[PDB]
Amino acid sequence: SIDVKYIGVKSAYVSYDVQKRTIYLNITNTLNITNNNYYSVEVENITAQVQFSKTVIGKARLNNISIIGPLDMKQIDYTVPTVIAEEMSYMYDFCTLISIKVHNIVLMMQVTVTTTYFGHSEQISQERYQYVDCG
Amino acid sequence: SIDVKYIGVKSAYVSYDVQKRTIYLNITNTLNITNNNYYSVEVENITAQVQFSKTVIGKARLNNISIIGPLDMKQIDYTVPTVIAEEMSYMYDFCTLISIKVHNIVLMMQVTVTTTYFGHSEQISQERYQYVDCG
Amino acid sequence: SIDVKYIGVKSAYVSYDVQKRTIYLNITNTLNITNNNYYSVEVENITAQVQFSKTVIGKARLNNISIIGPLDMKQIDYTVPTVIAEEMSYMYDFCTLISIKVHNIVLMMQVTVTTTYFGHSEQISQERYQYVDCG
């Protein structure tokens, strides 16, 4: 990939920015830019390409065959009991969180039992992330 | 891919931004841009391509075959009981969350038992994320 | 892909923005742009392409064959009982949330048992996300 950028606040090619309570006077700004970009990217020039798959079963005997793909989840248990018991008392809860299997971004590509692949595959993530903020 | 950007506030090619309580006076700004972009991208030039799949079964005997694709989820349990008991008492709850299997983004591509693929595949996420804010 | 941007507040090619309580006086701004973009993108030049799939079954004997595609979910259980008991007491709940299996964006593409694919596939997500905000 090319030119993948995370900029936290400000982006410019050229900047003349003036901020706070400043005096900016008699300034002469002159700019002459030549900025040309040429991209020949992810380009393919092929005579022949073959993705051949063949399965042959002769006079064979097959019994109890199990093929299982990735991410198989079996008998998973989450037990998260919350119990509050109070008498003659005071409870103050602020920003209290119980979080079970919380997901932000899930990117899945080519998750398979069998795969034949030719070419390009790409995953990009750019993120500003805050889970909890309080005061 | 090309030119994939996260910018937190401000984006320019040229910027002259004048912000707060400033004096900006007698300024001469002159600008002369040539900025040309040329893209030959994700381009393909091919004489032949073949995606061939063949299954032959002859005088075979087949019993108890299971083929199971990815992300099989079986007999999963979430148990999250919440109990409050009070007498002569005070509860103050502010911003209290119970969160089970919460998703933001799920992107799934070519999730299969079998795949034959030629060419380009792409996933992009760009994000400002905040789960909790309180005050 | 090309030029995929997330900008938090403002985007411009050339910007002369003046913000707050500022004096901007006698300013001379001159601009001369040439900015041409040329795109040859996802272009294909092919003489022959073949997607062949063949299944041949002769005098075979087949019994108990199961093919199961991805994301199979079986006997999943969610138990989230909430119980509040109060006498001579006070409950103040503000911004209290119980969230089970909540989804924002779910994108699924080419999710199948078997697939033969030629070309381009793409998923893009751009987002400002707040789950909870309160005060």
Author numbering:
A (entry chain A), B (entry chain B), C (entry chain C): 120 to 254
Tell me what the authors wrote about this structure, in their words.
TMEM106B is a type II transmembrane protein of 274 residues that localizes to late endosomes and lysosomes. Here we used structure determination by cryogenic electron microscopy to show that residues 120–254 of the lysosomal type II transmembrane protein 106B (TMEM106B) also form amyloid filaments in human brains. The TMEM106B folds shared a similar five-layered ordered core comprising residues S120–G254 and contained 17 β-strands, each ranging between 3 and 15 residues. We observed three TMEM106B folds, with no clear relationships between folds and diseases.
Our best maps for filaments with folds I, II and III had resolutions of 2.6, 3.4 and 2.8 Å, and came from case 1 (sporadic Alzheimer’s disease), case 19 (MSA) and case 17 (MSA), respectively. For all three folds, we determined the structures of filaments that were made of a single protofilament. In fold I, this region packs loosely against the other side of the C-terminal hairpin-like region with the formation of three large amphipathic cavities. Likewise, there is an extra density in front of the side chain of Y209 in fold I, but not in the other folds. Individuals with fold I were homozygous for T185 or S185, or heterozygous, indicating that fold I can accommodate a threonine or a serine at position 185. Owing to the compatibility of both residues with the glycosylation motif at N183, no differences in the associated glycan densities were observed. Filaments with fold I were more common than filaments with folds II or III. We divide the sequence that forms the ordered cores of the folds into three regions according to their degree of structural conservation: the amino-terminal region (S120–T166) is conserved in all three folds; the C-terminal region (Y211–G254) is conserved only in folds I and II; and the middle region (A167–M210) varies between folds.
